[PDB]
Amino acid sequence: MNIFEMLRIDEGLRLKIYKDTEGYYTIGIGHLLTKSPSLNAAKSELDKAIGRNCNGVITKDEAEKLFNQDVDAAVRGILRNAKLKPVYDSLDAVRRCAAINMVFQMGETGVAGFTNSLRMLQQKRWDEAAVNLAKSRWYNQTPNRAKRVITTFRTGTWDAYK
Ligand SMILES: Oc1ccc(OCCc2ccccc2)cc1
């Protein structure tokens, strides 16, 4: 188990443009294309991301390459964020995967709201952090995925993905 396998489970794999749980155009392994309601806008973003005229359809290799870029962008975003980096660096490898998973899903807009969760995680107050993480729109809107991520933070094991 690693971050790629974890997010592949949580996001699935689809080779044609689809909509995420919020209704936004997405492709591949959870690659957001646009929040615009315009399918043409999504198709432009796709062609820009892949470097060819895709017509809304990609190959598995292309989906996996976008996925690698997206995971790396999440990691680098954590490392560049003065609030997230100290917490990330305090975690073991399995819990770091849970952190990347959340940033992959929510980006930087969730940083402020998760201030108290981040403190509890840095303090290694795992049960309290798990309770706090569930008091969120994130948990209420995607509860099964959030429960898996939270269990990973609570236990430091892959039990929720096995
Ligand atoms: O959009 C978000 C949502 C939640 C966040 O924090 C919780 C997960 C985490 C833990 C350690 C290091 C980085 C991230 C950060 C951004």
Q: What is the CATH number of the domain that holds 124?
A: 1.10.530.40
142 Cα distance to chain centroid:
12
Tell me, what amino acid is at 71? Answer: V
Which residue's CA is the nearest one to ligand 1's atom 3? 110
CA of 140 to the centre of ligand 1 (A): 17
What is the extent of the structural domain holding 18?
Answer: 3-161
64 counts as catalytic: no
Q: Count the domains in the chain.
A: 1
Let me know: does 117 contact 129? Beta carbons within 8 Å. Answer: yes
Annotated resolution, angstroms: 1.0
Method in brief: X-ray
Distances (CA, A) of 101 to 6, 52, 62, 107, 117: 8, 29, 20, 10, 15
Q: Is the CB of 118 inside a 6 Å radius of any atom of ligand 1?
A: yes
Q: Is the CB of 77 inside a 6 Å radius of any atom of ligand 1?
A: no
CA of 134 to the centre of ligand 1 (A): 13
Distances (CA, A) of 54 to 33, 69, 155: 13, 18, 42
20 counts as catalytic: yes
Let me know: does 17 contact 46? Beta carbons within 8 Å. Answer: yes
Helices (H), the chain: 3-11, 39-50, 60-80, 84-90, 93-106, 115-122, 126-134, 137-141, 143-155
